[PDB]
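Recall from the previous chapter that SMILES is a line notation for molecules. Here it describes cholic acid.
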Amino acid sequence: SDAPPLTLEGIKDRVLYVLKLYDKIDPEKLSVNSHFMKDLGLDSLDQVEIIMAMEDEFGFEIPDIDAEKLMCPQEIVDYIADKKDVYE
Amino acid sequence: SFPKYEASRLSSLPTTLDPAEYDISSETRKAQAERLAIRSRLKREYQLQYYDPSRRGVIEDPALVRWTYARSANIYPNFRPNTKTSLLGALFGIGPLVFWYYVFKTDRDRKEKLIQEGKLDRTFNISY
Amino acid sequence: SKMELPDYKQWKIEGTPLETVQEKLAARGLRDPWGRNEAWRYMGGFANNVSFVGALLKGFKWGFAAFVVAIGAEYYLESQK
Amino acid sequence: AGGGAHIEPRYRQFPQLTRSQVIQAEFFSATMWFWILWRFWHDSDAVLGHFPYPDPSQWTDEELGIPPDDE
Amino acid sequence: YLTHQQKVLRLYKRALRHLESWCIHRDKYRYFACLLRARFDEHKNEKDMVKATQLLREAEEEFWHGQHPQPYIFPESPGGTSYERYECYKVPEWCLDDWHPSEKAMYPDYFAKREQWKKLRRESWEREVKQLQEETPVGGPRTEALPPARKQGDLPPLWWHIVTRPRERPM
Amino acid sequence: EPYPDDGTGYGDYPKLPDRSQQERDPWYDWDHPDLRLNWGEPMHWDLDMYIRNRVDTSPTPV
Amino acid sequence: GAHLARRYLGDASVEPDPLRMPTFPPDYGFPERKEREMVATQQEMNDAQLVLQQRDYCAHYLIRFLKCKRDSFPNFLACKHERHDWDYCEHLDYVKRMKEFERERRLLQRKKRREQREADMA
Amino acid sequence: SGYTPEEKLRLQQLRELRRRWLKDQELSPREPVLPPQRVSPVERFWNKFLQDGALWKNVIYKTYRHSIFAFTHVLIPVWIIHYYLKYHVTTKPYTIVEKKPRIFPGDTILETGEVIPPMKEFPDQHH
Amino acid sequence: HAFFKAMLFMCSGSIIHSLNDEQDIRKMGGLFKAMPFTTTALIVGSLALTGMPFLTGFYSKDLIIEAANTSYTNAWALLMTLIATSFTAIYSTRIIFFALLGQPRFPTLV
Amino acid sequence: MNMFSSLSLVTLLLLTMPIMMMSFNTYKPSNYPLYVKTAISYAFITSMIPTMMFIHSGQELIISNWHWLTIQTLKLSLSFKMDYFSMMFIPVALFVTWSIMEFSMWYMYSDPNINKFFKYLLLFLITMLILVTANNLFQLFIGWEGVGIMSFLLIGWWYGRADANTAALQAILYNRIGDIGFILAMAWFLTNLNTWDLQQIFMLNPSDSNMPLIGLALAAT
Ligand SMILES: C[C@H](CCC(=O)O)[C@H]1CC[C@H]2[C@@H]3[C@H](O)C[C@@H]4C[C@H](O)CC[C@]4(C)[C@H]3C[C@H](O)[C@]12C
Ligand SMILES: *C(=O)CCCCCCCCCCCCC
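With both inputs in hand, we obtain:
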């Protein structure tokens, strides 16, 4: 396809590079482990907007039955990793 | 208010616009939960054989067997001659045959007159 | 390879059509949090683009120059011999 | 496939170009206009009209051989 | 079933996709995304549990009238232009058991590493059955999902096909 | 719900809803992804007519 | 078609029918009518294999133009004057048949006045 | 409302095996172990004759490729077709029927030598 | 029609491949300069489809409206053809505008 | 004549060579897409020679090379009509197909079955040329259905996609309804004019033609 393969670390850069332009989170406080309810208490409806941003970034779209189970910037890389067969 | 959606056999009612999902009674929660119970018991039975390494063949599916047995071999022993089957059978079985008989009989009777009298053109007709 | 992402501290909504949204929503007391997320679609090479009429006239300056010389070039050997 | 200039896919930015794309692309754009103008000049009849349409109102009853109303 | 919290999230999730299909241009989408965003906060603080349902039904009905006839679909979802496009190139793993030895000898390294997994699965199978039966109600299981691996060495029960499924872009 | 006992040979076969197979959760992990069925599930009398290559009954905007 | 508004939203008796073009009497009416002559009598037309619709009266022109194309090959840009001559010759034929349209239309308008006079005499 | 502790572990445990499996799906530098392959001398000459770039000689190489294709796929078939058409197809009546050439005024016939008189004087005019 | 209709599909395919198998024009745009050669052919062919004078299509399309207009025809059929020809320009302008002009709508990494 | 007729058939025979060699006569999988493309390239050059002759002197001929079947008074041959319509369309179709195949080499470069994709593309082109140059209705019908069946296979290329199968079978369904009219025309011409050859159909020039032409219009629909 000529599309460059996605690396395990390369995904993480993109994931955070999107969360860092939200204008509702502190860039210095959001890390690989930053819960949106227990750590910095982000609104649930913001999860919908957060995931939509992810889907518009990677192309593919996450199901709503499993999008609701992902508020952990580390987990998004894990979910995308287990959806485009990325191992390194 | 916007016009209400009108369902049909070829266009089902959307789940969102259905006054049966939102109501949460005592029966619904213990019913929609029960469906998931048996649905999980079957999946557990299937999962055991599917993932078994000492198996090479086809997992017999009793639901599939019952589906085909009710479509071919169980129809007649559950058939009763009554006013519906007799009338439905008559106009679907004998109807078309009679209808096509008078269509072709009338057409060929009409043709034969035109050929005996010479009123049908067959100038170059030497293949039949 | 180790593809490097551009530094993120350059997405300014000001000077691009996204700001006009910010003024409109400021009137009713609201903001567009993802404004700088979409700010990459107006700055850089993407900034401005030919108009529909301009796109159609693509490569029209040279053609007219070639056309005028063409008719003139033919005219030279048209009423001379 | 092919020559494979292998232009790296840049992140949010304008994609890289080459010298061959624009020169050739611009070459045909100018060719179309040159061809459009050159043909329009020589034979513009095909696009506006070949022969004037003879209005029959501005005619005379004599050329048409109409016998006089007085018989 | 879907919790009333989940329904609002789904309704909000879709309403932006259809709304995004009406605007196309990004800037005109942002202007109305905030407006539609606001209309949720207008009744968000409500805690009646009987008028919120009424709004949701009126919300769902309102969504249907204005929903885009031809919503945008990502080209790998149920309805896209490349959904299941590569299902023909995906082949099971047991097909390699039927290879001829001559064509199996073309990959001496690959098949040695496969025999380990068959040994790994074959050894692990007995424990996985024992784990599932004990960690399951007497009358049978109640939901999907299986227990994770408790002790070291043991692997998550029922892992072979989930782990060894065909790749999403086989070729 | 058994089919009506009108003597047309249906017998005691379940009368499942007249819903196409395209009207099912596309993301739920099906035992038969193409058919959207589950092993051990009673199949609709007209299952072979409601497969995805055939009659569809999904809700329409109009 | 400006005249269409007259024939469909006006009077049908004045307008002529394209399928019923003048059945009026013979050349009588136009003193000393001249017969239209022809050049390619019978064999010249049936030797260049002209189409059954093309060889009406400009066959001499069309036959001449086809002669140039055969020789001018591959100079397909040549023979332009020959094509122009045939186009003009066809144009004159087009107007000549067009004259018959107006010739009959006024004859139709003239023919009704005499009938109107007789009806209105009493 | 994210993952329960069990779900987070199971997904992590699965991913640990999954990415191990995908790494196994890689071919060592020696793979595939293709069986010994005979190489024809005609192939050897080109590989040794090309070697470095030498774009100048590629035109000779391409001409060789086109000449071979223009011989087996064009010249040989047109011999077979022509032999078939000339001596078999055309020996039977009306197998190949041409359209008789158009005859314009003032032309001479190669076979019989007849001359068709030109057309009548044209009463033409300028423009 | 063979020359430019085939060209249009190939140029459309060129956009498809670059944008990672994306076909909706509501996720394209801003490609006038990114892919100049595909754009040139797309405009060249799109003009031919609309029937620019002195360009393949003019010698067939325009010569038909002339014969259709001046023939013993069906008025409603004659009207429908003319309305259709105008519609040819409208959806051609739809492709150019949403696929070449404006600002890009495609994902970030392409 | 010899050059015109010989160069008219060579174009058709050339296109079948990649199909014939696909029976394991020269195994070069990595080069087959380029082998097919180059065959189309020369087919264009060969076709231009008879095309030019038509432009110069308006030459035109039929070629009934083979006698296939004689059903009493109806004689069926593998006839070819090289005339205005075929002479212009053959170069155009080959010229366009040439560009499509060259484009398809890059576009379908990642497909495991690229070789099988070019054979199908070449099979369609052979069916279309049979359709275009057919001189009697039966030979035209061979190409008529041939293009119909290659469309079924190429539309359903990605056959794991139910929507591709549905679109593939849908094409056969609608074109089958049209084929009713085509067979209606064949029955009329044989019954009334006692032929399927276009030369004899036009020579007799029947007056009443509502039925046979109504059938063809449905075939074109
Ligand atoms: C000519 C063409 C492309 C190279 C070029 O541009 O000249 C090359 C590419 C692969 C070649 C073909 C393939 O190698 C298969 C055949 C191999 C033998 O050389 C006989 C001809 C044969 C059919 C070749 C003819 C021609 O030389 C081909 C088609
Ligand atoms: C007579 O045959 C005219 C046929 C053309 C039909 C199209 C008419 C369109 C009229 C629009 C108004 C234009 C007035 C100049």
